[PDB]
Amino acid sequence: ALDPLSETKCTLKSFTVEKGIYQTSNFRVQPTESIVRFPNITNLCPFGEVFNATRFASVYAWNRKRISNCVADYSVLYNSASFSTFKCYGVSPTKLNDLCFTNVYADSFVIRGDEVRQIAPGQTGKIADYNYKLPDDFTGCVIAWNSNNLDSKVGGNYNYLYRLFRKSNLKPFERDISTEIYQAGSTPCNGVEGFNCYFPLQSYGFQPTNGVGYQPYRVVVLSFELLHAPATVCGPKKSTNLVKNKCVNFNFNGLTGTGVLTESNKKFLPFQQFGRDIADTTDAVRDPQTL
């Protein structure tokens, strides 16, 4: 690499250069910088509105939010300090942003802080066994924030209930609204209260003066389910600035390549984003953001 004359000796593998023209290599211009152009970050699913929603269903009554055909950006909610605690199972919070999910079910409910520690794959206790159980393969995360200034009031808030008693333990992803009276002993119940007949559902006492462990916390459990169906909800795509007429490494939508971008007089069909040549190598593209 010292001199172009020395490139002749190294290519010919001889210390003597005879008179003539010799091609010792082929130069190629390396890309200066990486260009990232992604589609608009709008048309999301409103996770911030559901997390920040006024009232929630009971832990046994929890509402199933079907999340499909949108983009999920979890970096904004995590860096906004809008939650009390953050916990995940099996997947780092940064990995979720690069992955696409087939179907996502947002699990919303309000329980006391002492009952939040029981949310984890294959655990036990009151909320895990009798209310909502997490499967061992659950890939989602646990996010909670302190609602004591909202969901609690003077005199107690009876809106948020829970299932105290059940004859067995629930399976993961099993919602049971049955109000049937739990029979403790051999005394018949049949939906009638009495000796060894007790109403299983109970209402959480909620007031703003409750202790930190007993304060009501809004918990949104994100269920990430990958099925055989194609993935719908994907992580956030953050577009960058565009550079033209230079050698760059560009990644456009799901297409990558290296070359020089120049706007020409060609016109693609409105339904055709990418062009190709005779060899099916891309000779032109359309920007995912601007047209």
Partner 1 sequence: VNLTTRTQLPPAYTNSFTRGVYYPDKVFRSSVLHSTQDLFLPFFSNVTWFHAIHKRFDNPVLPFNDGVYFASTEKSNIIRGWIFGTTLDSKTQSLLIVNNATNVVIKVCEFQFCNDPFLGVYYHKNNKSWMESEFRVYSSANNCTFEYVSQPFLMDLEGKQGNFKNLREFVFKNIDGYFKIYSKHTPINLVRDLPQGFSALEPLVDLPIGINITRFQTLLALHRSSSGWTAGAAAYYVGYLQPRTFLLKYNENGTITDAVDC
Ligand X SMILES: *[C@@H]1O[C@H](CO)[C@@H](O)[C@H](O)[C@H]1NC(C)=O
**H-only helix segments in 1-41:** 4-12
Query: Does residue 63 touch partner 1 according to CB under 8 A?
Result: no
In terms of DSSP bridges, do strands 34-37 and 247-252 run parallel, antiparallel, or are they unpaired?
A: parallel
212, 131 Cβ separation under 8 angstroms? no
Strand order in the sheet with 247-252: 34-37, 247-252, 255-260
Query: Judged by CB under 8 A, how many residues of this single chain contact its own copies?
Result: 11
Instruction: Say how many residues make up the chain.
Output: 291
Give the Å distances, CA to CA, from 131 to 74, 165, 224, 282.
26, 10, 19, 54
Residue 160 CB, nearest approach to ligand X (Å): 18
Query: Does residue 94 touch its own copies according to CB under 8 A?
Result: yes
Annotate each residue in 148-187 with x if it binds its own copies (CB under 8 A) or - if it does not, as one string.
------------------------------------xx-x
195's contact among its own copies, partner 1, ligand X, none, with CB below 5 to 8 A by partner kind, is: its own copies
Of positions 6, 14, 32, 40, contacts ligand X by CB under 6 A = 40
Nearer CB in complex with partner 1: 76/231: 231
Enter the DSSP assignment of 268.
-
In terms of DSSP bridges, do strands 247-252 and 201-203 run parallel, antiparallel, or are they unpaired?
A: unpaired
Query: Does residue 195 touch its own copies according to CB under 8 A?
Result: yes
Query: Does residue 280 touch partner 1 according to CB under 8 A?
Result: yes
Query: Judged by CB under 8 A, how many residues of this single chain contact partner 1?
Result: 25
Sites of contact with its own copies (CB under 8 A): 78-79, 81, 86, 93-94, 184-185, 187, 195-196
